[PDB]
Amino acid sequence: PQDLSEALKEATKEVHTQAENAEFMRNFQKGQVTRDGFKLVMASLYHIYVALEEEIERNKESPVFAPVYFPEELHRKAALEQDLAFWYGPRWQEVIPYTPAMQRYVKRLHEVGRTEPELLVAHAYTRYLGDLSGGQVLKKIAQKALDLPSSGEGLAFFTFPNIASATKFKQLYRSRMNSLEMTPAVRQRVIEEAKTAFLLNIQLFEELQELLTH
Amino acid sequence: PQDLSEALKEATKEVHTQAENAEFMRNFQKGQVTRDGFKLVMASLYHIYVALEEEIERNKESPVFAPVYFPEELHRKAALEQDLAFWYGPRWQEVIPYTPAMQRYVKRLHEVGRTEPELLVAHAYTRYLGDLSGGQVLKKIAQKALDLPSSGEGLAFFTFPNIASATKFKQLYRSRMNSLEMTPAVRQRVIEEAKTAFLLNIQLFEELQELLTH
């Protein structure tokens, strides 16, 4: 379609479904998720967001990203640090896993951020808008499946404190995306990069499922 | 004594006890704190930390604070935003109270940060080491007293995730504090500012208790 945001949503319909159909996520949706499985996804997210937000801060003033720079509304790193301290303990930094599939995702993020900046919006879109949409249904399933103690920690990642209205914010974000100026060629690569983002998540889900079934 | 860290500890021994004996804090230690009372404490902390961390960022390059600048290890603003969203909802920002006692604390922080930043270390020490030290004790008490739902949020403030050992961190911090260079005059004021910090907290507790019982 004309609007970039509309083009992204349409082009990634297929891959988003594969993400949903992935064995690990199927089990997740079916409410079938274990603490060992959930700890792995949280560890993954920490690594992914550290890299993503590291690159966002690097190109925050570039006209290829500035329009969608919302640091206070979206930053998740601090939230994940808090969560991992709960799931893995005070020494979480020394014990959390950093797998090959997590590394492949992180590696692509730094490449885009350092050599293909104009494609960063594709990864920010995929992660931020997805976690802000499907993230809340998974939040509901997670807590009613994890049987957590009432310690008041472990799920800060699923709450965006600086965003009063999700729908309202997502509309604003869509607008800022459509305001980005790019040659039709660049637009094609941003669309493809978004699909690549889903594929990186899907291969991660495949790997985590493999690690948990031994 | 000779070391700044030891001088501050000895000089504030009196006011610390008063703070511990303030009715509101006394009732908190005894597990006697309501959700409304706790929310007022968190609201207070948010304002105080926003102001403190705002001024720290302003003077982080200056030699009067640089030595004790540990952003990743100690920043609390984000954790408090996460908790307030849980305690007050998506629009916490526009509904949390801002009382005169909270304001007097905030005002003094900006005054110090803008006109005599060489004293900011007194406020950083008081707040950070105070919350880090007793944080674990008060955390368990809060859990038992508030009977939170199992949604994994609401007490992130009580966990400093980027600090594996509170003991080891405080040793390094005290070390950095003693490396601080200052004239004998300024040093006397730093010690005095530490007392003022405690009195600002004591005054805050007296107000919260008054709001809760009239």
From Swiss-Prot, chains A, B:
A soluble form arises by proteolytic removal of the membrane anchor. It is found in: Endoplasmic reticulum membrane. It is a single-pass type IV membrane protein. Keywords: Apoptosis, Endoplasmic reticulum, Heme, Host-virus interaction, Iron, Membrane, Metal-binding, Oxidoreductase, Phosphoprotein, Transmembrane, Transmembrane helix. The record marks 131 as: Important for catalytic activity. It comes from the Eukaryota. Heme b binds at residues 9, 16, 125, 174. Expressed at higher levels in renal cancer tissue than in normal tissue (at protein level). It catalyses: heme b + 3 reduced [NADPH--hemoprotein reductase] + 3 O2 = biliverdin IXalpha + CO + Fe(2+) + 3 oxidized [NADPH--hemoprotein reductase] + 3 H2O + H(+). Residues 1-214 are cytoplasmic. It is an enzyme of class 1 (oxidoreductase). GO terms for biological process: angiogenesis; cellular response to arsenic-containing substance; cellular response to cadmium ion; cellular response to cisplatin; cellular response to heat; endothelial cell proliferation; epithelial cell apoptotic process; erythrocyte homeostasis. One of its GO terms (molecular function) is protein homodimerization activity. (Microbial infection) Interacts with SARS-CoV-2 ORF3A protein; the interaction promotes ORF3A-induced autophagy but is unlikely to be involved in ORF3A-mediated induction of reticulophagy. Belongs to the heme oxygenase family. It is linked to Heme oxygenase 1 deficiency: A disease characterized by impaired stress hematopoiesis, resulting in marked erythrocyte fragmentation and intravascular hemolysis, coagulation abnormalities, endothelial damage, and iron deposition in renal and hepatic tissues. Clinical features include persistent hemolytic anemia, asplenia, nephritis, generalized erythematous rash, growth retardation and hepatomegaly. The transmembrane domain is necessary for its oligomerization. This is Heme oxygenase 1. It comes from Homo sapiens. The gene is HMOX1.
